[PDB]
Design an enzyme around this catalytic site. Structure first.
Site, PDB file in Angstrom:
ATOM      1  N   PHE A 209      12.189  37.225 -35.478  1.00 12.31           N
ATOM      2  CA  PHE A 209      13.114  36.244 -36.140  1.00 12.31           C
ATOM      3  C   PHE A 209      12.841  36.387 -37.476  1.00 12.31           C
ATOM      4  O   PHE A 209      11.754  36.713 -37.911  1.00 12.31           O
ATOM      5  CB  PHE A 209      12.667  34.930 -35.505  1.00 12.31           C
ATOM      6  CG  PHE A 209      13.875  33.836 -35.837  1.00 12.31           C
ATOM      7  CD1 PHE A 209      14.875  33.737 -34.964  1.00 12.31           C
ATOM      8  CD2 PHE A 209      13.556  32.939 -36.889  1.00 12.31           C
ATOM      9  CE1 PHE A 209      15.953  32.726 -35.318  1.00 12.31           C
ATOM     10  CE2 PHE A 209      14.489  32.096 -36.997  1.00 12.31           C
ATOM     11  CZ  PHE A 209      15.605  31.972 -36.436  1.00 12.31           C
ATOM     12  N   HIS A 212      13.371  32.393 -42.996  1.00 15.21           N
ATOM     13  CA  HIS A 212      14.238  31.092 -42.919  1.00 15.21           C
ATOM     14  C   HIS A 212      13.257  29.931 -43.437  1.00 15.21           C
ATOM     15  O   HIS A 212      12.007  30.182 -43.536  1.00 15.21           O
ATOM     16  CB  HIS A 212      14.585  30.964 -41.372  1.00 15.21           C
ATOM     17  CG  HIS A 212      13.532  30.761 -40.534  1.00 15.21           C
ATOM     18  ND1 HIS A 212      12.652  31.749 -39.860  1.00 15.21           N
ATOM     19  CD2 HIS A 212      13.001  29.369 -40.097  1.00 15.21           C
ATOM     20  CE1 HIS A 212      11.781  31.013 -39.194  1.00 15.21           C
ATOM     21  NE2 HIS A 212      11.814  29.508 -39.317  1.00 15.21           N
ATOM     22  N   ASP A 214      12.723  25.993 -42.194  1.00 14.53           N
ATOM     23  CA  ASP A 214      12.996  24.992 -41.109  1.00 14.53           C
ATOM     24  C   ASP A 214      14.078  24.027 -41.459  1.00 14.53           C
ATOM     25  O   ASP A 214      14.000  23.255 -42.619  1.00 14.53           O
ATOM     26  CB  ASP A 214      11.565  24.536 -40.461  1.00 14.53           C
ATOM     27  CG  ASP A 214      10.611  25.451 -39.920  1.00 14.53           C
ATOM     28  OD1 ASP A 214      11.042  26.526 -39.449  1.00 14.53           O
ATOM     29  OD2 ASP A 214       9.495  24.963 -39.446  1.00 14.53           O
ATOM     30  N   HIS A 268       9.390  31.745 -43.957  1.00 16.61           N
ATOM     31  CA  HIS A 268       8.482  32.236 -42.955  1.00 16.61           C
ATOM     32  C   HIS A 268       9.480  33.150 -42.060  1.00 16.61           C
ATOM     33  O   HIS A 268      10.593  33.020 -41.932  1.00 16.61           O
ATOM     34  CB  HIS A 268       7.538  31.393 -42.341  1.00 16.61           C
ATOM     35  CG  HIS A 268       8.268  30.250 -41.689  1.00 16.61           C
ATOM     36  ND1 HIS A 268       8.864  29.284 -42.272  1.00 16.61           N
ATOM     37  CD2 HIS A 268       8.631  30.121 -40.510  1.00 16.61           C
ATOM     38  CE1 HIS A 268       9.635  28.279 -41.452  1.00 16.61           C
ATOM     39  NE2 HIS A 268       9.079  28.787 -40.308  1.00 16.61           N
TER      40      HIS A 268
HETATM   41  C1  LIG Z   1       8.141  30.366 -36.802  1.00 17.47           C
HETATM   42  S1  LIG Z   1       9.660  29.743 -36.280  1.00 17.47           S
HETATM   43  C2  LIG Z   1       9.451  28.741 -34.755  1.00 17.47           C
HETATM   44  C3  LIG Z   1      10.044  29.366 -33.595  1.00 17.47           C
HETATM   45  N1  LIG Z   1      11.453  29.315 -33.974  1.00 17.47           N
HETATM   46  C4  LIG Z   1      12.368  28.208 -33.494  1.00 17.47           C
HETATM   47  O1  LIG Z   1      12.038  27.343 -33.117  1.00 17.47           O
HETATM   48  C5  LIG Z   1      13.932  28.342 -33.835  1.00 17.47           C
HETATM   49  C6  LIG Z   1      13.959  28.800 -35.239  1.00 17.47           C
HETATM   50  C7  LIG Z   1      13.873  27.608 -35.957  1.00 17.47           C
HETATM   51  S2  LIG Z   1      12.179  27.467 -36.983  1.00 17.47           S
HETATM   52  N2  LIG Z   1      14.403  27.228 -33.726  1.00 17.47           N
HETATM   53  C8  LIG Z   1      15.545  26.952 -34.248  1.00 17.47           C
HETATM   54  O2  LIG Z   1      15.868  26.641 -35.409  1.00 17.47           O
HETATM   55  C9  LIG Z   1      16.712  26.847 -33.051  1.00 17.47           C
HETATM   56  C10 LIG Z   1      17.325  25.476 -33.017  1.00 17.47           C
HETATM   57  C11 LIG Z   1      16.621  24.146 -33.513  1.00 17.47           C
HETATM   58  C12 LIG Z   1      16.576  23.322 -32.303  1.00 17.47           C
HETATM   59  N3  LIG Z   1      16.970  24.175 -31.079  1.00 17.47           N
HETATM   60  C13 LIG Z   1      17.125  21.913 -32.604  1.00 17.47           C
HETATM   61  O3  LIG Z   1      18.386  21.745 -32.033  1.00 17.47           O
HETATM   62  O4  LIG Z   1      16.436  21.337 -33.177  1.00 17.47           O
HETATM   63  C14 LIG Z   1       9.877  30.984 -33.169  1.00 17.47           C
HETATM   64  O5  LIG Z   1      10.437  31.718 -33.240  1.00 17.47           O
HETATM   65  O6  LIG Z   1       8.256  30.933 -33.139  1.00 17.47           O
HETATM   66 FE   LIG Z   2      10.250  28.259 -38.522  1.00 13.64          FE
END
Ligand SMILES: CSC[C@@H](NC(=O)[C@H](CCS)NC(=O)CCC[C@H](N)C(=O)O)C(=O)O
Ligand SMILES: [Fe+3]
Length: 329
Positions: A209, A212, A214, A268
């Site tokens: 990923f 970005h 948060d 990050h």
């Molecule tokens: C170190 S990023 C954390 C995590 N990623 C996510 O949780 C991803 C990337 C955003 S941080 N989450 C998201 O942003 C996607 C949708 C946000 C969530 N579904 C909502 O509606 O509240 C990951 O890829 O490990």
């Molecule tokens: Fe994140």
């Protein structure tokens, strides 16, 4: 190769008690970490994260393709037009490796006034069949409230760190209305790992990923003990060490707005690692109408040249933008 990021371990247990001096010494550590890389580990948090990991593994490893379509968000299943946030986010074998299950406040029931009004960002959770996943829904709803309690304590520490009374954020973070979400993300081991599911950063780092900030007030994250996160600092991207006993905490862009970037939302990204692991974030969101007047703790009069922004406006605009920038998860 890449330097280790400074991510201190902060004992947050005084934030649950009534020793005010001790709470101020934790708030100073939060202030220091927020001004430096923007990350810290919360330790002595009181949550049973081993059991969280075991119940999440039993869910991810037993749910079937049939159940995934039946739970899918609208990006995967056009029949589920009300599921924009809550439900299952499918992998696409050969193309997209990660898969996840998101749920929201368990108090968003069919009779909730914001559900009746069809207010954006509010949805009723969807759950797998109880006979196929015994105890899962009860476990996951109880986890929501365990990590809500930790997040309320952390918000007391942030408030004190910024020179405010300890309920400055917490008063807008309430069980009947919070927009907070839990996401149970599965990153799989795959042999062979498809190249199409691997992104490449401008510096050549293989990613799952991209960079970005948060979309949150703060993010309260449990991960497996597999190193993968990196934080951009003035000295470049640095590796965040894993710790599967603590919660990794950072600010989101709503905190950066409210503090006029005194507490930045750190940029990050997630390195590609071919390992079966879990990323279980709780995004601490406020209520739809919650507005906190922006301020600046570096200015003598505390005033900021930022417009107030309701959390609902923030959240709706940010969730769309993050999908546009970094792809549908
Ligand atoms: C170190 S990023 C954390 C995590 N990623 C996510 O949780 C991803 C990337 C955003 S941080 N989450 C998201 O942003 C996607 C949708 C946000 C969530 N579904 C909502 O509606 O509240 C990951 O890829 O490990
Ligand atoms: Fe994140």
């Amino acid at each position: 190769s890449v330097s280790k990021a400074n991510v201190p371990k902060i004992d947050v247990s005084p934030l649950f008690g009534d020793d005010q001096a001790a709470k101020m010494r934790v708030a100073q550590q939060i202030d220091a970490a927020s001004r430096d890389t923007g990350f810290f580990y919360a330790v002595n948090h009181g949550i049973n994260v081993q059991r969280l990991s075991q119940k999440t593994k039993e869910f991810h490893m037993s749910i079937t393709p049939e159940e995934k379509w039946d739970l899918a968000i609208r990006a995967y299943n056009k029949e589920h037009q009300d599921q924009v946030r809550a439900g299952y986010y499918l992998s696409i074998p050969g193309k997209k490796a990660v898969e996840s299950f998101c749920y929201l406040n368990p108090n968003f029931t069919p009779d909730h006034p914001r559900i009746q009004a069809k207010t954006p960002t509010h949805e009723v959770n969807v759950w797998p069949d109880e006979t196929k996943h015994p105890g899962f829904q009860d476990f996951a709803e109880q986890y929501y409230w365990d990590v809500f309690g930790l997040s309320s304590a952390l918000l007391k520490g942030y408030a004190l760190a910024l020179g405010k009374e300890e309920n400055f954020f917490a008063r807008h973070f309430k069980p009947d209305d919070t927009l907070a979400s839990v996401v149970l993300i599965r990153y799989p081991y795959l042999d062979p790992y498809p190249e199409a599911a691997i992104k490449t950063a401008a510096d050549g780092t293989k990613l799952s990923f991209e960079w970005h900030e948060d979309v949150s007030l703060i993010t309260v994250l449990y991960q497996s003990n597999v190193q993968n996160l990196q934080v951009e600092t003035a000295a470049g991207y640095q590796d965040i060490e894993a710790d599967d006993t603590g919660y990794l905490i950072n600010c989101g862009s709503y905190m950066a707005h409210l503090t006029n970037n005194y507490y930045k939302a750190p940029i990050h990204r997630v390195k590609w690692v071919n390992a079966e692991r879990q990323s279980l974030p709780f995004f601490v969101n406020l209520g739809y109408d919650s507005v906190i007047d922006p301020f600046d703790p570096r200015e003598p009069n505390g005033k900021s040249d930022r417009e107030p922004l309701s959390y609902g406006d923030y959240l709706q605009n940010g969730l769309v933008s993050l999908i546009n920038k970094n792809g549908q998860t």
